[PDB]
């Protein structure tokens, strides 16, 4: 084997560099030319808080098996990740670095790195995705603690010890470093804000949440204290191996990418453990805006399938908010989840309601979906009853956004209603003024439908549209649908 300082990075990276004139973002969705310019052991800024250099950890920390899966990764980025682990970690704490080559196009990307000290390469015989790939690496791990890292990261000064200390003290703690930013355009390494936590909206997409005023205030005594987080980013974390196994590893039916970070986060919290972000542990990551690799069936479908598997097993009744926020997800088969449901039962996990109240109280539950009230706007004007009642005409007036005579509802029976009065086409003759009359389910004269991107109101069964061109001559009328500005009506919820 060769010690990493002696690895021929030039020969390794040189065999896949971007040709002149070719798109430097095509293969990885990050600038490969800039990644290739960097040395495998390039220096990076110490982004840690000053108090970190004084924080201590036990001497007898458990060694870890570092698992890095990868699929068509840029050679320079993959090598740099491996070297950062070897250079920035105490050798006695790195039992091995397991590279799981998830069926990359060129087997040499991984095989060539197998000559480096402590690197073990496991190539999947077929594409497996990150979930099954991480499990393969974990299953092969010989250490008592697992460390997962994406294949485009750069570990910082004393990044490992703070993480291991947490797990050595309590095996049920799943911890992650503050993830610094490696710019996808010019690869500069920049420190992430330390006032963040992992979170998500009801569309179940991971996002970074900024701490509330009180949370920041409470950390003034010790700014580098662990940060309990509702969710971990997903690709960078440390976990006791036996705990990873007994808690259920990963849902093996999840494919490619997405949703597994949500699943393990819910599972760990609901089933007794905890998730932490450790300020003194810093690791940079090349964040991208798009995945460069393929998703069988499309990324949208795969993400929805994986997410449904997580939601259907862990969120209880709250899963309905996900389907409300993401309608397209309801029509996505997700397969059998019995093994996971049984896992939850066996582990005697707490309900999702408990998770929301005790772990993520910041996430607000949305109101139930129902018919919405609002204004029908045209320019800066709003459909106005004019203060009229039955048999009276309607018109338009400057919107005041105070409801009242400008508040309407587009009902399911297709009426345009204000309280108990509805817009009525008393005369279909083009140019006829419409009138307000009591709403009746079986009055065909009160039926309207939105058309053209919900920008107009057409009387059902006719080619007549609500028109304000007669507003100064008696009130709104029905007119042959045409390109007139006077026929534009937008429903704004309020």
């Amino acid at each position: 084997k060769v010690r990493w300082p002696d690895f021929n990075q030039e020969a390794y990276v040189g065999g896949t560099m971007v040709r002149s004139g070719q798109d430097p973002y095509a293969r990885n969705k990050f600038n490969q030319v800039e990644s290739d310019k960097l040395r495998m052991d390039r220096a990076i800024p110490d982004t840690r808080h000053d108090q970190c250099q004084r924080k201590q950890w036990r001497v007898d920390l458990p060694a870890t098996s570092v698992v890095i899966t990868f699929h068509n990764e840029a050679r320079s980025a993959l090598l740099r990740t491996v070297v950062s682990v070897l250079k920035k970690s105490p050798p006695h704490l790195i039992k091995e670095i397991i590279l799981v080559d998830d069926y990359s196009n060129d087997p040499e990307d991984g095989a060539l790195l197998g000559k480096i000290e402590k690197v073990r390469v496991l190539r999947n015989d077929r594409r497996e995705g990150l979930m099954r790939s991480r499990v393969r690496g974990a299953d092969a791990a010989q250490a008592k603690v697992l460390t997962f890292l994406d294949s485009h990261c750069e570990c910082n000064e004393h990044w490992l010890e703070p993480l291991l200390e947490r797990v050595a003290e309590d095996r049920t703690r799943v911890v992650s470093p503050i993830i610094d930013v490696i710019n996808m355009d010019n690869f500069q390494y920049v420190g992430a804000s330390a006032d963040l936590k992992g979170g998500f909206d009801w569309n179940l997409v991971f996002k970074w949440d900024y701490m509330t005023p009180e949370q920041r205030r409470s950390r003034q005594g010790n700014p580098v204290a662990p940060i309990k987080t509702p969710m971990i980013a997903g690709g960078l974390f440390v976990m006791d191996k036996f705990y990873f196994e007994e808690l259920g590893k990963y849902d093996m039916m999840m494919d490619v990418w997405g949703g597994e970070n949500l699943e393990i986060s819910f599972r760990v919290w609901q089933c007794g453990g905890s998730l932490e972000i450790i300020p003194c542990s810093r690791v940079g990551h090349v964040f991208r805006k798009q995945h460069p690799y393929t998703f069988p069936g499309g990324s949208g479908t795969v993400f929805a399938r994986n997410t449904r598997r997580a939601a259907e097993v862990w969120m209880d009744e709250y899963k309905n908010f996900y389907y409300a926020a993401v309608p397209s997800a309801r029509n996505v088969p997700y397969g059998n989840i019995q093994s996971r449901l049984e896992l939850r039962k066996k582990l005697s996990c707490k309900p999702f309601k408990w998770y929301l109240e005790n772990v993520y109280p910041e996430l607000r539950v949305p109101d139930h979906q129902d018919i919405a009230f609002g204004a029908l706007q045209q320019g800066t004007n709003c459909l106005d009853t004019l203060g009229h009642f039955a048999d009276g005409v309607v018109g338009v007036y400057e919107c005041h956004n105070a409801g009242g005579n400008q508040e309407w509802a587009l009902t399911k029976e297709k009426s345009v209603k204000h309280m108990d009065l509805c817009l009525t086409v008393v005369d279909r003759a083009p140019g006829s003024l419409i009138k307000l009359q009591g709403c009746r389910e079986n009055d065909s004269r009160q039926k309207w439908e939105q058309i053209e991107g919900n920008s107009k109101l057409r009387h059902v069964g006719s080619n007549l549209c609500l028109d304000s061109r007669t507003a100064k001559s008696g009130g709104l009328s029905v007119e042959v649908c045409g390109p007139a500005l006077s026929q534009q009506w937008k429903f704004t919820l309020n």
């Binding site: 420190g191 900024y210 964040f287 805006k289």
Partner: peptide, 9 residues
């Protein structure tokens, strides 16, 4: 579509 980058220091 991917893991978003956090706000920097």
């Amino acid at each position: 579509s991917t893991t978003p980058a956090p706000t920097t220091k």
